[PDB]
């Protein structure tokens, strides 16, 4: 049965992630930007019902609701080639293009104020999807709508669909880079709290890591927010390749969440891409072994998560899932598991179930893969506890020094005090402590 996902885009970064993911899904399923299925995808093996909702025009339309309080991202999404690919009725655009002002409290207020409109789009997508599994919230942890509206959207999806998985593509702020929002620390903390409480699983997409990985591994000088959104789209297309092309294992989001999240609360996932190189980096007659792919993904130059290289937090993978796109030999997958276990190519959490699965699945036929073996890494590592600690410390620095506290206290969430930011930092700290415990034998 198809399992549609309601892609909720909040903030500029979230709208870019959602639009790029929709474009990547249309390309991989062979759906043209007008939604009219591309001529090469009529016989496509893509489970278009599974990934995209079939509109009245039969356009392969992902159940995507783009809700942003700033009109710039909404206009760019509506101006993308894929405008007719997705259903227009699920895109709610706030005429007040003022945004949340990089304040998570203001973002949550905006999400709740557009809760009727956004919850309407979410429920419309659920009714328009045969077996809508849950909602995927692409937003920015440092933005106001992305962090705040991301929290509001995650909470709204959890309340309307408590039995539906709430996955978040939360753009974590640069903990090593001075955020332009002094209240961006509070916004990041609130987005992390939303990920921990109103979201079932949070994929932290640290823009500092995006720039670092693009510059060092992909040789992309200064990755832009557009570049981060494009990378997110490529990673999403890699993760949904097995969604469009039906495989034998990990056929649903709930199954992937179970295989990657031994702790129901500690579902915050760090990201990595393997091989991490520019498309111009043609692996010269290099038969990428499954073990070689595992080593390259485990290489920090290939991880797309800005996890502070904190020697205090013993980063270890709670669960490791290697999503391989292309022609991958299943026997080579078993050999890769053996070689990675022997060479310790991946460090696992000491207090989580050992999950090293080698599953062979096909990519979307409409999505051409330049590398015979492409790799997307979703790993639950305690280094995310380092990134969460950096975010929490930044949030504490903003709350304690009243950095952008005028903007934070201007919203009802922090009207009395920076309670929303403080509870957010507390939730982030608790998650970081639990993740460090998970890498430690004492988590259980």
């Amino acid at each position: 049965m198809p399992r549609e996902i309601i892609t909720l885009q909040l903030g500029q970064c979230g709208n870019q992630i959602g639009f790029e993911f929709w474009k990547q899904l249309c390309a991989e399923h062979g759906i043209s930007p007008e939604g009219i299925v591309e001529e090469f995808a009529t016989e496509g093996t893509d489970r278009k019902d599974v990934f995209f909702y079939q509109a009245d025009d039969e356009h392969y339309i992902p159940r995507a609701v783009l809700l942003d309080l700033e009109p710039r991202v909404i206009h760019s999404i509506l101006n993308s080639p894929y405008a007719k690919l997705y259903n227009p009725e699920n895109i709610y655009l706030s005429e007040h293009g003022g945004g949340a002002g990089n304040n998570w409290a203001s973002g949550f207020s905006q999400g709740e104020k557009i809760h009727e409109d956004i919850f309407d789009i979410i429920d419309r997508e659920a009714d328009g999807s045969d077996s809508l599994e849950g909602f995927v919230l692409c937003h920015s942890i440092a933005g106001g709508t992305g962090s705040g509206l991301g929290s509001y959207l995650l909470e709204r999806l959890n309340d309307r669909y408590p039995k539906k998985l709430v996955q978040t593509y939360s753009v974590f702020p640069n903990q090593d880079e001075m955020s332009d929002v002094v209240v961006q620390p509070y916004n990041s903390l609130l987005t992390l709290k939303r990920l921990t409480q109103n979201a079932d699983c949070v994929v932290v997409l640290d823009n500092t890591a995006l720039n670092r990985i693009a510059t060092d591994r992909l040789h992309i000088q200064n990755p832009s927010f557009s570049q981060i959104n494009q990378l997110v789209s490529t990673i999403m297309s890699a993760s949904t390749t097995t969604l469009r092309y039906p495989g034998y294992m990990n056929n649903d989001l709930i199954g992937l969440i179970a295989s990657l999240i031994p702790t129901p609360r500690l579902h915050f996932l760090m990201t990595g891409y393997t091989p991490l190189t520019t498309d111009q980096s043609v692996a010269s007659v290099r038969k990428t072994t499954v073990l070689d792919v595992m080593r390259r993904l485990l290489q920090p130059k290939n991880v797309m998560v800005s996890t502070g290289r904190d020697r205090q937090t013993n980063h270890c993978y709670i669960a490791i899932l290697n999503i391989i796109q292309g022609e991958v030999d299943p026997t080579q997958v078993h050999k890769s598991l053996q070689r990675i276990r022997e060479r310790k190519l991946a460090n696992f959490i000491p207090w989580g179930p050992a999950s090293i699965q080698v599953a062979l699945s096909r990519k979307s036929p409409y999505l051409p893969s330049a590398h015979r073996v492409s790799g997307l890494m979703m790993a639950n590592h305690t280094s995310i506890s380092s990134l969460f600690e950096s975010s929490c410390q930044q949030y504490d620095k903003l709350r304690k020094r009243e950095a952008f506290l005028e903007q934070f206290r201007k919203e009802d969430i922090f009207k009395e005090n920076f309670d929303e930011l403080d509870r957010s930092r507390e939730v982030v700290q608790e998650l970081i402590d639990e993740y460090h415990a998970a890498t430690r034998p004492d988590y259980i």
Partner: protein, 255 residues
Amino acid sequence: YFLMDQGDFFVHFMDLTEEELKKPVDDITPTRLEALLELALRMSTANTDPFKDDLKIDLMPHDLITQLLRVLAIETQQEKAMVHADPTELTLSGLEAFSFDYVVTWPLSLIINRKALTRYQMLFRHMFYCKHVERQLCSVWISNKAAKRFSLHSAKWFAGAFTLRQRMLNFVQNIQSYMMFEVMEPTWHVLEQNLRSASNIDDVLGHHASFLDNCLKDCMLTNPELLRVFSKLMSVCVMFTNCLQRFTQSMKLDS
């Protein structure tokens, strides 16, 4: 049919057709199963498979492992103890009994013998049982979502269910990865090559016999005690998930 590669039909095979699989031997209505199979056959892009009609509903007069342990785990002490055990009067659900059998014509494809059909039927019933079990485990994994906005430190039943699912889901994901990697990925090409190498009746029989017997030894389900050990190991994780879900159902109706 019974050889995977119909991924959409697989995702629609255990989500719907397992309604009365837990019903009695004759309690489950087969009309609903046939309707569900037809809907999954023709409501998606699985029409590329051209032998969905050959996928006929079957039911072994024992469980897929009841008959197995009755014959494979026989000739030592159970060939007269429980070899011929009838599952109808005992607890034998539809899921335990059902399988799929194949028959082929006389003038063409006169090699589908009733014995080979029964062997293939047991293979199909065991493969779809595993697929349905994997789907059920994935469904049960998402249980800690109704209280996902509630702290799990004070959710002893739900917290313990999540902690045990931490390893149960790995036990399913790694298994579904390794088995599909070793058997299906190798065996498909192996059968293709053997058929392409066969030229006579004897050669085609050898290719088919390899593709059947070697897979019958790949699963390690040909032993008198390993089957019972696998049954014990498989009836424990599912029971744990069910007990945890029953304890967590207080949030559904008791709350």
